Design an enzyme around this catalytic site. Structure first.
Site, mmCIF file in Angstrom:
data_model
loop_
_atom_site.group_PDB
_atom_site.id
_atom_site.type_symbol
_atom_site.label_atom_id
_atom_site.label_comp_id
_atom_site.label_asym_id
_atom_site.label_seq_id
_atom_site.Cartn_x
_atom_site.Cartn_y
_atom_site.Cartn_z
ATOM 1 N N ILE A 15 0.825 -1.207 0.000
ATOM 2 C CA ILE A 15 0.000 0.000 0.000
ATOM 3 C C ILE A 15 0.863 1.262 0.000
ATOM 4 O O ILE A 15 0.497 2.280 -0.598
ATOM 5 C CB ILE A 15 -0.988 0.012 1.184
ATOM 6 C CG1 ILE A 15 -0.322 -0.355 2.501
ATOM 7 C CG2 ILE A 15 -2.154 -0.905 0.883
ATOM 8 C CD1 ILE A 15 -1.282 -0.326 3.700
ATOM 9 N N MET B 291 -7.379 1.546 5.889
ATOM 10 C CA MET B 291 -8.217 2.652 5.430
ATOM 11 C C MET B 291 -8.228 2.666 3.906
ATOM 12 O O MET B 291 -7.178 2.524 3.269
ATOM 13 C CB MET B 291 -7.716 3.991 5.984
ATOM 14 C CG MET B 291 -7.690 4.059 7.511
ATOM 15 S SD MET B 291 -9.305 3.918 8.317
ATOM 16 C CE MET B 291 -10.063 5.469 7.839
ATOM 17 N N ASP B 292 -9.416 2.852 3.323
ATOM 18 C CA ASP B 292 -9.555 2.652 1.884
ATOM 19 C C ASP B 292 -8.805 3.714 1.085
ATOM 20 O O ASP B 292 -8.183 3.401 0.064
ATOM 21 C CB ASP B 292 -11.029 2.649 1.492
ATOM 22 C CG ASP B 292 -11.853 1.686 2.329
ATOM 23 O OD1 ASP B 292 -11.288 0.700 2.844
ATOM 24 O OD2 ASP B 292 -13.074 1.919 2.462
ATOM 25 N N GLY C 96 7.141 3.711 3.783
ATOM 26 C CA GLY C 96 7.250 4.378 5.060
ATOM 27 C C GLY C 96 8.701 4.687 5.382
ATOM 28 O O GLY C 96 9.615 4.290 4.659
ATOM 29 N N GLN D 137 8.447 -0.576 4.397
ATOM 30 C CA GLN D 137 7.314 -0.412 3.505
ATOM 31 C C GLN D 137 6.043 -0.925 4.172
ATOM 32 O O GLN D 137 6.082 -1.785 5.053
ATOM 33 C CB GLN D 137 7.501 -1.132 2.170
ATOM 34 C CG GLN D 137 8.221 -0.301 1.124
ATOM 35 C CD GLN D 137 8.257 -0.974 -0.235
ATOM 36 O OE1 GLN D 137 7.978 -2.171 -0.360
ATOM 37 N NE2 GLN D 137 8.562 -0.195 -1.270
ATOM 38 N N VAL D 138 4.918 -0.317 3.798
ATOM 39 C CA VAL D 138 3.605 -0.634 4.348
ATOM 40 C C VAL D 138 2.868 -1.569 3.398
ATOM 41 O O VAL D 138 2.859 -1.363 2.181
ATOM 42 C CB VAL D 138 2.807 0.658 4.602
ATOM 43 C CG1 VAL D 138 1.706 0.401 5.615
ATOM 44 C CG2 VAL D 138 3.737 1.777 5.055
ATOM 45 N N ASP E 20 3.410 16.666 11.861
ATOM 46 C CA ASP E 20 3.506 16.324 10.446
ATOM 47 C C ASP E 20 2.109 16.115 9.862
ATOM 48 O O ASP E 20 1.745 15.029 9.413
ATOM 49 C CB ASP E 20 4.377 15.086 10.244
ATOM 50 C CG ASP E 20 4.893 14.967 8.821
ATOM 51 O OD1 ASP E 20 4.801 15.968 8.074
ATOM 52 O OD2 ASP E 20 5.395 13.882 8.451
#
Ligand SMILES: C[C@H](C(=O)Nc1nc2ccccc2[nH]1)N1Cc2ccccc2C1=O
Lengths: 248, 325, 826
Positions: B19, B102-103, B22, B26-27, B145
């Protein structure tokens, strides 16, 4: 939701250290030495009192899940302090903790860090985080000592004497398993209670309820004197074992 | 129990896709094998071991387990790559931070431009963000942020704030040294451009105001590449920093250094005259130069624009999905 | 980094706008036709139009209007581009030398503003005192036309009415006055304001508001003697002027939406109206002179003249000649007669101007076995739908195959010497409960025909209410012969089944070549389709046979043959199907990390996915495991229109903002994260909307290779009919051509003084970036057209690199031969 971090005194008879043949006195010594090592190292590095305490609480919790014979205390302490620095936003480089640990430890003691001190410490971080179940946020008696003292009104000098004597008691309580027996709010009250008896002050007079003789009940609900006495006895036993008398 | 984090394995999640990228890893989007619920997995890599476990992850683990709000992302658990190594030094396995998936993200929806947000949508959106920021600001944490990329929205219409990598506790009583630049340039407040170093929670308010304007234009308000050009753009709209409106601007390191081309007058109400009155007043207050005169998160909720917004019946996002083909 | 080259093979053919006036000379009547980025200037004759000049602009022409301010002999031209570049242009001719003068110029973009729904509107005052621009909601921008405003400086007037439909300046007013239709929650209204250049504000307008039709679309400013305005809707036409109010609601116009208007009689007596079914109407203003001598408007009348192309713009020109400028079909010159013909029509076609129209899909096929390749495109819409056969021969030869229905997809099946084409036609709910087509078309004029009898969705238990007069699409698969282009067969899909994807291929061990169609069940209630079919047909002996059907739980947006397996995208899912020995599709593996998997392309075992908002992803089939794996994703948000694979590492995409980009694998996998990231290495603003990327070339090369510097060949179609070509370069060749562009841009004079670098910068409302990795071949090919002094000026101090000679100076004659070779790729 949140993990449970408190045991009964009776349960300390069954720490991994105890069941591997370490006697109660020795584990207590190993805890005092490891806590004081964390305190001394971090003080030399200029660390905030919360950072020292967080490391010590990590340390005390750690040896509820592991044995002192299998994990050397001075390495664990250094690791705890290293992690505490990041959690409480007072970070230090691992090499600097080792440098200080070498300055303060003799050669036999520093042998626990093995041939590569920095590596032995950094490797334990995985075990530490998993052991503390990733619950990094910790509250300490200090904030409650101040929150409650602010609500006392009276002689500026008698209260400040109460606070400083109690603050000293909190520092000493970090060498003990009280961190593992009672929530910090109870510790702050107990040390206020202890200092009051020692200074012969009647704290209820300084509260908003001056005829409520159990003054602490408005700060911490549901605390029997039994508990505050048990805590006081433990702190005073440290002073009766060591040469140092009560601070007064 | 559910509280024993760091022991369950990532074998319990079927990995679906990447997705996002980060800071610490990575996510990934994954599906829980046991429950079927979709989660988001942030890979924390301690193998670099320059300084061990990343502090940014520690901040996110410490703060998000303390903060529980409908408008702040829920960290469900932490899982480990694999316990096979059997030796602590040999083990390099990463850790994964589990979150509710979360979409969509606010930037993605706007950047494609498919979505046109009505005032009622904006009311529902901004009330949620400020209610969440109020929860954090009341608990004395600063996001530091706040950008569109960090505002997550599900197709239902719920908004959650997510990236707490730079979040730190703020004490008004004790002045503490801080980082000189925290927020992304487009959403950075003017004091931090002038290098306040002791910033108040009103830094996050300025960002949320930049979003409020952006939701009405569909384009970011202050787009620049360099810190001076940004101060110039802010100055063209809000007016130049000067003691007349910000008595303490003189105490800032770069006040004399970073002068804008002119001493501009404030035009915010002119250049945004196409915005509803109730909303325009909120923008004007949020985009105030002096952080001590800039409104608080609570004050925004007690505004004509957001006060009477009932979130019980919220308008869902019109994220179109046919005729776009 | 990556290096690529983009050229135009066919210029835009769609007519975006047309205006008539006296631009080249105060004496001649000119017709200025606007195609995307292209301005054509004609002079009106008694037989047709005499072309005189064509220029390109570095921008999409948004507003085009001709005005003549006091003191000028002839009309001046105002153009505003879609990136908000404004300019005033003048025609100047010195004997044989024709040039276009930039009299004033500037960019009118506001730092803050919300772009309006109904788009940029530009109007000019009847006294040419100012130019009105509607760029943003709630704002009216005024450029005053004073002699000193050479930079086109302007100011904004706050506009209370946020949602404006249309606006015009009015005739016959004491001060500059605007009349406009706006929309608020209560409905639509017509309102007036006066514009004060001295006060820089609006004042109360000459007449009161009226409530107008809910779908009021266009505003017509009527000149004296009438004054006032006409408002065109879906059902009614109304005239407003102070106290006067008229309304005519003839039933004929309710049938089709009216989209364009033109004035026939300068006095306002007659107006032309056109609607989306191609009908051309005459709107008549019936006058009555009063005893006072005042000329008032008695009544309005609407008379049907005939049928033209679906027209974007109408221009009356002179005599009976009218120019039908079409974006969806061929443009036309038609003559209006006073007497109707025997069919009842007053309109007779004169000339037909080829427009490739919307290019929805296309394929390259070598019909004649020539090694060349010809382009068959799905072009046009509605009654203008057609196939176009394009071959090179110096001009392109185009054959038109009319379909009279919308073509959607095309694919060639060699085994059957025919093409498969997906098409949809409009029928209307009629009194039988069924539907009736407005005209016969390809799917109804097929030699043989069939209708799906599938029972898959026959479960019903679903309410789908029908009102008389509502439109519906009816989708068909057309089998069309490759030599005659006769419709051999038409297969009609289910009611409410939309055909979306089409392939021709063999699968598995099945020797038969099939037509395979992916569909979606579309019901108005459904935001996103939830039912669909993959259908396997076999075209054999003049009949289409249904071989197998697979039910899917979504829309089959894209399909592609994949190493004997069928790769299909169903909504979010990307699926791989196998073809069993029982002639049925069986799922092998799936990928679910997508929002909408709109576009698919393959190469080897690697698959490129295009998403509605998530840009592009590289997916690989792993045969050892029998499943997909995500190689790398582009994390910059882009709304895709089409994708294509250039080579194993470079991937080409088109954005809905008329932008092109190229992503590459990092190819330096120090960490997993770096490989999993796709870096955008090329950025280019095409200016066109790319529907289809297609590998191939139209150039006639058999057994001959000249080793052109360019390597590879991707053709693409656009909405405006432009056909372009993308090809790759070596680092050495790019640097040469790029350095030359920078030299050419300093030398070549732009219309409107628009910076070339600005024009090609990647542009979305939110992001504007300088172009990278792309050579504007249309700029490079213009070197051959600049004068010799300019050629030599360009080559001064120009050095080559990484060649036989490391540093080598260029002469004007060296570059002329190179560019000529570069013009040979199309
Ligand atoms: C919005 C969604 C996402 O990352 N959600 C998310 N929920 C989260 C919850 C907690 C932490 C991070 C999260 N991140 N995206 C963005 C994207 C871009 C490109 C390709 C796929 C996707 C995709 O699925």
């Amino acid at each position: 939701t949140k993990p449970c971090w408190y045991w009964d005194k009776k349960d300390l008879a069954h720490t991994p250290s105890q069941l591997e043949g370490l006697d109660p006195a020795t584990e207590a010594r190993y805890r005092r030495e490891g806590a004081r090592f964390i305190f001394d190292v971090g003080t030399r590095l200029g660390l905030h009192y919360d950072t020292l305490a967080t490391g010590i609480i990590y340390f005390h919790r750690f040896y509820m899940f592991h044995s002192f014979k299998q994990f050397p205390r001075y390495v664990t302490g250094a690791c705890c302090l290293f992690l505490a620095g990041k959690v409480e936003e007072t970070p230090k480089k691992c090499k600097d903790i080792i440098k200080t640990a070498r300055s303060l430890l003799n050669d036999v003691q520093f042998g626990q860090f093995g041939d590569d001190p920095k590596e032995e410490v950094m490797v334990l971080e995985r075990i530490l985080l998993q052991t503390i179940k990733f619950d990094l946020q910790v509250e300490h008696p200090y904030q409650f000592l101040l929150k409650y003292a602010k609500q006392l009104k009276g002689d500026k000098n008698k209260i400040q004497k109460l606070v400083q004597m109690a603050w000293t008691f909190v520092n000493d309580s970090l060498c003990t398993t009280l961190s593992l027996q009672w929530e910090p709010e109870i510790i702050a009250v107990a040390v206020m209670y202890l200092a009051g008896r020692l200074c012969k002050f009647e704290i209820q007079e300084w509260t908003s309820k001056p005829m409520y003789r159990r003054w602490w009940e408005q700060f911490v609900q549901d605390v029997p004197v039994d508990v505050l006495e048990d805590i006081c006895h433990q702190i005073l036993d440290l002073y009766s074992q060591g040469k140092q008398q009560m601070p007064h | 129990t559910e509280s024993d984090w760091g022991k369950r394995c990532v074998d319990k999640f079927d990995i679906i896709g990447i997705i996002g990228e980060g800071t610490y890893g990575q996510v990934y989007k994954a599906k829980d094998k046991d429950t079927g619920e979709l989660v988001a997995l942030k890979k924390v890599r301690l193998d670099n071991e320059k300084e061990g476990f990343p502090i940014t992850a520690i901040r996110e683990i410490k703060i998000l387990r303390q903060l529980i709000h409908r408008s702040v992302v829920n960290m469900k658990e932490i899982v480990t790559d694999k316990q096979d190594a059997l030796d602590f030094k040999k083990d390099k396995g990463a850790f994964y931070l589990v979150f509710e998936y979360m979409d969509h993200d606010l930037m993605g929806l706007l950047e494609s431009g498919l979505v046109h947000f009505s005032e009622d949508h904006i009311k529902s959106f901004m009330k949620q963000l400020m209610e969440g920021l109020e929860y954090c600001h009341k608990k004395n944490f600063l996001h530091r942020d706040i950008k569109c990329s960090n505002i997550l929205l599900n197709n239902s219409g719920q908004i959650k704030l997510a990236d707490f990598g730079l979040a730190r506790l703020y004490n008004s009583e004790e002045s503490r040294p801080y980082t000189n630049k925290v927020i992304t340039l487009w959403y950075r407040p003017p004091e931090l451009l002038l290098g306040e170093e002791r910033y108040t929670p009103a830094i996050d308010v300025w960002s949320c105001g930049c979003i409020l304007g952006e939701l009405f234009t569909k384009k970011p308000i202050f787009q620049a590449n360099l810190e001076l050009a940004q101060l110039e753009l802010i100055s063209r709209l809000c007016g130049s920093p000067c003691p007349a409106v910000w008595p303490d601007v003189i105490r800032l390191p770069y006040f004399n250094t970073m002068k804008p081309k002119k001493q501009y007058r404030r035009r915010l109400r002119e250049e945004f005259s196409f915005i509803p009155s109730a909303a325009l007043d909120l923008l004007d207050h949020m985009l105030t130069l002096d952080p001590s005169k800039r409104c608080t998160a609570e004050q925004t909720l007690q505004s004509d624009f957001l006060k009477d917004v009932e979130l019980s019946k919220m308008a869902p996002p019109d994220l179109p999905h046919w005729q776009d083909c | 980094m990556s290096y690529n080259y983009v050229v135009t093979a066919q210029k835009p053919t769609a007519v975006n706008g047309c205006v008539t006036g006296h631009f080249t000379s105060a004496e001649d009547l000119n017709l200025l036709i606007a195609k995307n980025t292209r301005l054509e200037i004609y002079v009106v004759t008694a037989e047709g139009l005499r072309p005189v000049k064509e220029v390109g602009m570095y921008g999409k022409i948004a507003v085009m209007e001709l005005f003549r301010p006091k003191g000028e002999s002839k009309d001046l031209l105002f153009i505003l581009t879609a990136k908000y570049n404004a300019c005033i242009l003048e025609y100047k001719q010195s004997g044989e030398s024709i040039d276009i003068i930039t009299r004033a110029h500037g960019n009118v973009q506001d730092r803050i503003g919300r772009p309006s729904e109904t788009g940029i509107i530009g109007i000019i005052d009847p006294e040419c005192r100012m130019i009105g621009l509607r760029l943003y909601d709630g704002l009216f921008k005024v450029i005053p036309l004073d002699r000193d405003n050479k930079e086109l400086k302007a100011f904004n007037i706050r506009l209370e009415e946020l949602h404006v439909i249309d606006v015009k300046f009015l005739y016959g007013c004491q001060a500059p006055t605007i009349c406009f239709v706006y929309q608020d929650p209560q409905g639509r209204h017509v309102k007036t304001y006066e514009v004060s250049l001295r006060e820089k504000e609006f004042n109360k307008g000459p007449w009161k508001q009226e409530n107008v039709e809910a779908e009021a679309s266009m505003v017509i400013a009527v000149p004296e003697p009438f004054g006032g305005a006409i408002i065109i809707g879906q059902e009614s036409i109304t005239y407003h002027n102070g106290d006067k109010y008229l309304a005519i609601a003839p039933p004929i116009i309710k049938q089709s939406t009216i989209v364009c208007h033109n004035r026939v009689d300068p006095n306002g007596s007659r107006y032309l109206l056109g609607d989306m079914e191609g009908r051309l109407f005459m709107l008549l203003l019936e006058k009555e002179e009063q005893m006072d001598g005042t000329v008032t408007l008695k009544d309005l009348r609407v008379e049907l003249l005939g049928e033209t192309s679906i027209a974007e713009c109408l221009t009356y020109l002179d005599n009976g000649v009218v120019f039908v400028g079409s974006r969806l079909g061929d443009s036309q010159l038609v003559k209006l007669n006073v007497d109707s013909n025997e069919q009842g029509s007053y309109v007779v076609a004169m000339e037909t101007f080829t427009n490739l129209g919307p290019i929805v899909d296309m394929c390259v096929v070598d019909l004649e076995r020539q090694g060349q390749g010809q382009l068959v495109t799905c072009s046009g819409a509605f009654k203008e739908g057609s196939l176009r056969i394009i071959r090179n021969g110096q001009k392109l030869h185009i054959r038109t195959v009319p379909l009279y229905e919308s073509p959607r997809k095309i694919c060639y099946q060699e085994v059957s010497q025919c093409f498969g084409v997906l098409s949809s036609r409009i029928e209307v709910q009629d009194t039988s409960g069924g539907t009736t087509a407005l005209r016969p078309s390809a799917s109804t004029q097929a030699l043989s025909s069939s209708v799906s009898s599938s029972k898959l969705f026959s479960s019903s238990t679903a309410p789908h209410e029908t009102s008389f007069g509502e439109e519906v699409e009816v989708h068909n698969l057309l089998i069309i012969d490759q030599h005659t282009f006769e419709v051999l067969h038409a297969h009609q899909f289910l009611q409410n089944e939309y055909a979306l994807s089409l392939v021709s291929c063999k699968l598995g061990k099945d020797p038969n070549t099939y037509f395979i169609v992916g569909t979606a069940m579309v019901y108005p209630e459904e935001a996103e389709p939830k039912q669909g079919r993959i259908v396997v047909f076999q075209y054999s002996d003049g009949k289409l046979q249904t071989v197998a059907e697979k039910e899917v739980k979504g829309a089959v947006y894209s399909m592609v043959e994949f190493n004997g397996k069928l790769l299909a995208s169903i909504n979010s899912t990307v699926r791989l199907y196998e073809w069993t020995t029982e002639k049925e599709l069986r799922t092998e593996c799936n990928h679910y990390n997508n929002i909408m998997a709109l576009y698919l392309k393959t190469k080897g075992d690697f698959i490129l996915v295009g998403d509605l908002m998530r840009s592009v992803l590289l997916l690989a089939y792993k045969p050892m495991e029998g499943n997909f794996e995500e190689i790398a994703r582009d994390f910059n948000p882009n709304w895709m229109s089409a994708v294509e694979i250039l080579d194993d590492d470079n991937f080409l995409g088109a954005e809905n903002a008329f932008n092109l980009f190229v992503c590459q694998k990092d190819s330096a996998a120090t960490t997993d994260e770096e490989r999993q990231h796709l870096q955008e290495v090329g950025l280019f603003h095409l200016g066109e909307f790319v529907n289809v990327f297609c590998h191939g070339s139209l150039v006639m090369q058999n057994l001959g290779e000249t080793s052109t510097p360019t390597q590879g060949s991707v053709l693409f179609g656009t909405v405006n009919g432009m056909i372009g070509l993308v090809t790759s370069l070596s680092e050495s060749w790019y640097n040469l051509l790029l350095d030359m562009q920078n030299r050419l841009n300093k030398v070549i004079k732009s219309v409107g003084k628009i910076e070339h670098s600005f024009w090609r910068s990647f542009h979305t409302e939110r992001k504007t970036e300088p172009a990278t990795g792309f050579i504007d071949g249309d700029l490079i090919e213009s070197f051959l057209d600049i004068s010799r002094p300019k050629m030599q000026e360009v080559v001064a101090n120009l050095q080559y690199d990484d060649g036989s000679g490391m540093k080598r100076e260029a002469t004007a004659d060296d570059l002329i031969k190179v560019v000529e070779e570069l013009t040979r790729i199309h």
